[PDB]
Amino acid sequence: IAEFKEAFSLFDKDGDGTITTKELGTVMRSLGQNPTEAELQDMINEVDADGNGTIDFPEFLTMMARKMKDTDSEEEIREAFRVFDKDGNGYISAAELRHVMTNLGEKLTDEEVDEMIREADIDGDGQVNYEEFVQMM
Amino acid sequence: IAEFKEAFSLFDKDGDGTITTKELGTVMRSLGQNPTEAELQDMINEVDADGNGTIDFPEFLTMMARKMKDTDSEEEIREAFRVFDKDGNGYISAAELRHVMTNLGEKLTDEEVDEMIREADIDGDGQVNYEEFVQMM
Amino acid sequence: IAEFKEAFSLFDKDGDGTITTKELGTVMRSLGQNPTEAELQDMINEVDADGNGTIDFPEFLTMMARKMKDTDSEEEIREAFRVFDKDGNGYISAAELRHVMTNLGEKLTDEEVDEMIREADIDGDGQVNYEEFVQMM
Amino acid sequence: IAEFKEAFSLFDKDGDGTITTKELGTVMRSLGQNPTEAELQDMINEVDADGNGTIDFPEFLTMMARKMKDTDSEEEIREAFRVFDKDGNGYISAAELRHVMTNLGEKLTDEEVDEMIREADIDGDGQVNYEEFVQMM
Amino acid sequence: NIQGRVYNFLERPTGWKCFVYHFTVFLIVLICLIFSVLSTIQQYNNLATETLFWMEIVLVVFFGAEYVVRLWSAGCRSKYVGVWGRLRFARKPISVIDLIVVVASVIVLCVSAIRGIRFLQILRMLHVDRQGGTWRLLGSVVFIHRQELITTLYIGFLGLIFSSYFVYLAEKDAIDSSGEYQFGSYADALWWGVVTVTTIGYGDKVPQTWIGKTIASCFSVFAISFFALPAGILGSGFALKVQQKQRQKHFNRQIPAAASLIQTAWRCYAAENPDSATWKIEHHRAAIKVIRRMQYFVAKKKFQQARKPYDVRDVIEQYSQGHLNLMVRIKELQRRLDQSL
Amino acid sequence: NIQGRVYNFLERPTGWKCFVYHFTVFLIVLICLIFSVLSTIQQYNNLATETLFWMEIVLVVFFGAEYVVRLWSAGCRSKYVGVWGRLRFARKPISVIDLIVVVASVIVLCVSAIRGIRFLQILRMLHVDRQGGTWRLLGSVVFIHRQELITTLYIGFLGLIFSSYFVYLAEKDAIDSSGEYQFGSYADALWWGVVTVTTIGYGDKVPQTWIGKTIASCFSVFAISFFALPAGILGSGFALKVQQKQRQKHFNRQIPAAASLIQTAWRCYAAENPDSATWKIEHHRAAIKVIRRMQYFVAKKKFQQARKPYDVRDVIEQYSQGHLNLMVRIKELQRRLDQSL
Amino acid sequence: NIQGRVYNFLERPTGWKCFVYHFTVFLIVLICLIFSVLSTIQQYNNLATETLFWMEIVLVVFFGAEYVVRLWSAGCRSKYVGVWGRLRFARKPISVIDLIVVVASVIVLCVSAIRGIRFLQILRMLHVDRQGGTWRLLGSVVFIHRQELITTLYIGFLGLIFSSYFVYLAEKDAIDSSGEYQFGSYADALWWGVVTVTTIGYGDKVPQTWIGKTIASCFSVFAISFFALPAGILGSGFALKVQQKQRQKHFNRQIPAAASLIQTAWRCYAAENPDSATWKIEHHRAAIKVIRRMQYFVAKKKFQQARKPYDVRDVIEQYSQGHLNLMVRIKELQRRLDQSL
Amino acid sequence: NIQGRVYNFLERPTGWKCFVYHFTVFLIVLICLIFSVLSTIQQYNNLATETLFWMEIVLVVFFGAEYVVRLWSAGCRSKYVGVWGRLRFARKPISVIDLIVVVASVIVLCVSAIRGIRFLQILRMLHVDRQGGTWRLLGSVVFIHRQELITTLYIGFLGLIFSSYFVYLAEKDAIDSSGEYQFGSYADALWWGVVTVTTIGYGDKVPQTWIGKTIASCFSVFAISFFALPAGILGSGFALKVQQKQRQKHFNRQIPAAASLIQTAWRCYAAENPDSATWKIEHHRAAIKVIRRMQYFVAKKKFQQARKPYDVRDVIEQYSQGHLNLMVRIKELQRRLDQSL
Ligand SMILES: [Ca+2]
Ligand SMILES: [Ca+2]
Ligand SMILES: [Ca+2]
Ligand SMILES: [Ca+2]
Ligand SMILES: [Ca+2]
Ligand SMILES: [Ca+2]
Ligand SMILES: [Ca+2]
Ligand SMILES: [Ca+2]
Ligand SMILES: [Ca+2]
Ligand SMILES: [Ca+2]
Ligand SMILES: [Ca+2]
Ligand SMILES: [Ca+2]
């Protein structure tokens, strides 16, 4: 509860009460991600709950309240994995998983993909059962 | 009836017969509101009844004829109040009403919001019955 | 038949076989109308029958073949007149007809509107029966 | 199989693994076609099978695998020919076929149209049976 | 103006008083019909005939007065004017029905029991639907779905004929429980088919041999839908038409289009006469006429789209127009910048 | 807050415990109705009457307690407050039905067999549908399709009347198999028509003369659809309404519109009084009022579009706004470039 | 050209004279069918047989003449040419039906009462629907809704079977009023089910024991809809198809797409032969072929979208194209401005 | 791979050989059911019982072999693995039905006439619909229209109850033609209502007093539609679902969205552990977590829109994104031009 106040304070950078898109872009530039204006607008719209175009503290609390591990999110992640998986089964070959994550979407680094493979394909087989991997998260 | 002629004359500023968007913007700048072109176009389209993009004197008379206090407007204002009201009842807490009017939409000044609260929450309770407030208007 | 060849030749201005939008704009500028690019594109699309964006001689012949006085056009003109006519009847007051034609759409000149009124409201009444006027055309 | 690798290599021009729109435009400029950015984007989207905006080698193999002479393509070409053919029959006059191919769509050269007519209207009649012509391809 | 007020009060009502009047006359007609139904029974024939005679004569006098008043008031509209205008007004099917009802009632009263007066009041019951408002909607929807109300009324009819013939062949010689041949002739089988494919099923004729029962079972589950199809088609058409009416363009968005159409049509008409005031904005004569023709065609094309409801076509064409204008502005800006530098 | 909790638990339920309570009371009412049905048979009349009397008295005591608790808890809402608020709450049709059921049951128990208690529990079976949620949807859909549920119920009725009269004329004098005149009077023919145009077909009355059978065959295939049309119309309307509900705007996209509407309305109200704080941003008085009126009209126009679902109108108007803004920016850029150079 | 005129007059009519001819032949066939129906009754058998024999022989001579004329005129189309073209034309189902009717009528006349001539004229009644226009629409709609006309015809059938078995178990041993076992075997219960789940209800079989009546009541209200579902599905499909046809792209907007498709296909074909005139705009051979393949795929993709009606997909893709072009122009303007400065 | 091939051949078929196998087994089951129906008749009982016993034993052996093969092959999927995976596979309703059929058939054969084998094969007839494909569509559509299939099944039921009670009151004491009281008790009136509001109309019970006939006429035309409404609702829902399926997004347009969703979810998971490789692009820890949470929410929001079909929402949001990007580019161009000058 009190931790979110510290997180909200650093994003604001001016102490007014609203996280404007410019402030979020400044925070990301400080991190060093170099985002796009469209991406920032999409993030704000996803987080905003009043349609005013700015993030309020109750809206930030609402965003930080709901988390993962819910059925509506685990099912979504399983369906996203099924999108890549061929032959209808529940097994994805390690080569396909490694190739997709390094090219499609936001390209992960080699170390991150290696850690993902190690944590997912814990067994010695060449295919990672994405069901158990999703259940782990 | 004759009063509308004086009101129409000052908006025109050239004595031709049509209130162009530029003339309305000039009047607003004289007042000191600094509007946007999109807002002026929306206002003209709302007032215009012939689709020519300009306000004619019969159109101005039509706009000034219909007024508030009708059922189709009182119900709309009540629904707008219900949008903010939670817990399904007909009571809005004073804190929520004061917070919303100073941030969302067109931000009212502190004096206007204080006058609104005094006229609405006439009783000493912390919640303003918006039904009686709408009935007052 | 042979007359259309002379009409098509002057619009072309280069003797290639297609009436480009630039050529039509040049012809209109020679006449002295000063059109807009959107209007020229709309005219070409209305006349064009092959979707290539240019007017061909068979397309010009097709455009010049079909004419007015057909039922599908007389009914359309009668409906357009009904749009202005109030009180459901078939009579339009001369003041309304004169006012509309000089302001809405493409503003006709005073002489043209006077000639239209004289040819339409041939009788001495203050209202022009648009049915007989349309039947005259 | 091995031939596609040589074809893919020259389109890439940098040896990374993806045929970007800029690389395709450079190849076309080397050929001397001078395309448009919209056309290149449409071609990439038609060939792309992962939605990433770039052509991958498996996608190139998929594109080069499926070919013409299938029923779903022969029927499409026959319908395209029927679009031009009037009077409901299966015969297109040589004049109409020659005129359309030199003006509409991408204007073919005179030699190409002459070769098309010779290969299509093999018989001495003035009308080319497009059914047999499509069956030839 | 009084003539127009009378015409609006009688035909095409728009208020509550006219609504009350029309509901009252419809209720009077319905009560007369109910009394006629009760009089058709021999039990009530003692005085129902006399009271219906009096009600019918007063009602026909009232309808004659209403019809003559409506005929007098029809002169308000431009189409109905003078003597020929009244005759053209009397050509309308509703006016023809009212005139036929009045004349037939007068003839019956002149020529004391009345036999055809029941049919006369049944026809009179049609008087409520003014200006064909009820029939026009159904006619428009049927015309829109003309190519699908024929398929269901031709495949369904053909299936009915074939199934009835097969049932007749299966149960041609089969004595029923009471000893009467159910499907004695093909006409009886056809009547059974018309009764079964419409989910009526009176029960007078039921197949007896197991072959006929099997054929009826195999065809009823399939060919019945081909006869209930028109109901579903028309219902979905009505719902879609209501949905489209919910998405109609505002009435103020077609006035400029109508003005442009009328002005272009008048300009084209005036271009025919060389001595006219339209030549204010010799070989140019053949060029101005083509320009005016194109302008008229454009104005007519826009007006039709103005009257039609909102659609994806409007969005795509409007975006194309806006994009062309924006591209022209960008091109002129670039050209001016290059010329300056 | 306890009053609000009680009101939410009784009326407009939102959880599982309230759902269980409502299902339990509905099941108790249904079981009482089933026992009443079994008691209507003379075989079970020995003790069913007594057990139903006991169940009815305990159930009416329970319903009286529930109704008084609901009346007490109705004070949570702003509309129902004080003494007149309770009376206004009791004016609702569901509250009227509950009060009538309770009072009538008490009167019957005071005045041991009960004859009207069957109708009382039949009416009590309506208690489940709270706040008119079931009836409101049907009422809205019927009101939307008002101009098409009348056409099918007027052309269908007229066709029924005409066909019944024609069948009566065809089969007026035709003795049936048992020697009883089927269509003795017009009432019998009308009953046959009401039975046939609804695809019921009991079989008590069947046309006998071939003329009547031919007329019934020719009209049944056509005029039956005019009576099944309301079902299809309402079904397609329900499906389209569900589809539109699937495309509703998010609840967070109308809060700014509501705020703007309320603020503009309050500003217009405050502009009436010259001595107010709204005059912070003499002939200017007549100008500020017009500006506030236009702003209020714009805010009301946007709020209605905000509550309506997504549509092509929203796309076209939003593109028009964006294009106007972009054109203004391009024009100002060009003007600045020209002024600098 | 005379052959084409004859073919157009006989098949795929497009005028009023051809419409009159087709309506006349259909009316003649219908009158012959009506006379056959009247002849099936023994009362009219005296001369109806002879007049039907004469009408049938003249009608079969007319149909033979029409069929040979149509076979001669079918050579107009490219597909039907020479000797094999006529045989391929005769392979069409309508031509097969006409040939079968003519041959069977000739055989019956050669081999004086005719028994199968009734079925022959029933089949002849199918002659009106030319080029399968009526059947093609229904086939297309059924194929579109294939995955939903099976669900309603499988869940409905399963519910019918289960309900019929339960009714048979409930009313296996129950003597009716007349002493005849209604549900003696499972076949009788299945017939009752096929009669009830289709809202036919003849009344020959009615459950008697209260258990069977309760089961029939509980299942009729639910499982009946599973059999009327295909009618509603097909009706809504027909209405939606009509609505989509109302929003078809103009015929002039697909000619450039067809031209591009044909030109790209011909270019791809000509690229196979190295010695061709297509090489006017050695390792480049493998590169030009890929370019032509991509161009052909793009042209085919655009042509399919050109033939499809207007849709949100077209709007979004066209806006994407326009936005990409505008962004390219803005980028080039910025690049030129930066390079100049 | 052989296990996967066997599983694909048995469950979720995708070819013609599997289609032929499934059609063959369904036809065998249907033929067995037909033979059972013929055996239920006492005429064919001589050898039908024995041949059905042999067919049933061979069929249950075949079904046991198929079920054990399917249970062995179910290990291909990740969910069904090991011993508990097989048990979880056996929990599916279709597997439960097959196991129940096999066990019950074995028990009946062990315990020579079989009475319940008819019900066993009726249940076996459900074996064709694999993976619940037929039931899932109906369940989804009913769940979508849950708020409208209850209104029609509650207003219709209430109208049925009220109308049946009114008819019972009107015709409580009315001797029929045969001297038997039609509506003796309320149960008989309720049965008549269930027969009439469903357009069945057996004819066993018909109102006799004119009051009952009038009530039935006045209510049948109205309350019947409230029971045919579910059929129309579900039919229109099926048609609209098919239309939406016709406008589905291409399968290649959701792969990047799925990749982004999975990558963001994994990044959020890895952000929990401070010692991870995700920290390559101390108070910054609380800031990176919020950024990753927002990115995950955006990716999830885009993926849902990617899986949904094309809609006006997609067009408006995509235009908003494009307009924002274009406005940003115009603003940066203006800023650079002003800074340079
Ligand atoms: Ca800020
Ligand atoms: Ca906010
Ligand atoms: Ca693994
Ligand atoms: Ca001005
Ligand atoms: Ca104006
Ligand atoms: Ca208060
Ligand atoms: Ca040119
Ligand atoms: Ca052209
Ligand atoms: Ca006049
Ligand atoms: Ca690259
Ligand atoms: Ca790729
Ligand atoms: Ca040839």
Residue numbers in the entry:
A (entry chain D), B (entry chain B), C (entry chain H), D (entry chain F): 10 to 146
E (entry chain G), F (entry chain A), G (entry chain E), H (entry chain C): 95 to 205, 215 to 384, 497 to 556
Quote the study that presented this structure, word for word.
The KCNQ1 ion channel plays critical physiological roles in electrical excitability and K+ recycling in organs including the heart, brain, and gut. CaM co-purifies with the C-terminus of KCNQ115, it has complex effects on channel kinetics, and is a required accessory protein in the complex where it is needed for trafficking to the plasmalemma, folding, and tetramerization. Here, we report cryogenic electron microscopic (cryo-EM) structures of Xenopus KCNQ1 bound to Ca2+/Calmodulin, with and without the KCNQ1 channel activator, ML277. We utilized a biochemically stable form of Xenopus KCNQ1 (xKCNQ1, residues 67–610), bound to Ca2+/CaM4 to perform cryo-EM studies in the absence and presence of ML277 (xKCNQ1-CaM and xKCNQ1-CaM-ML277, respectively).
We obtained cryo-EM structures for xKCNQ1-CaM at 3.8 Å and for xKCNQ1-CaM-ML277 at 3.9 Å, both with C4 symmetry imposed. The xKCNQ1-CaM structure is in the same decoupled configuration as the published xKCNQ1-CaM structure, with the voltage sensor domains in the activated state and the pore closed. We observe that the structure of xKCNQ1 alone shows almost complete identity with the density determined by Sun and MacKinnon4, highlighting the accuracy and reproducibility of the techniques used. The high degree of similarity between our apo structure and that of Sun and MacKinnon, suggests that an extra density we see at the proposed binding site when cryo-EM samples are incubated in ML277 is due to the presence of the drug. Thus, two independent data sets with ML277 show density for a ligand at the same location, whereas two data sets without ML277 show the absence of density, which strongly supports the proposed location for ML277. The xKCNQ1-CaM-ML277 structure shows a similar decoupled TM configuration but a differently twisted C-terminal coiled-coil domain. The C-terminal coiled-coil displayed a resolution worse than 4 Å and was modeled until residue 556.
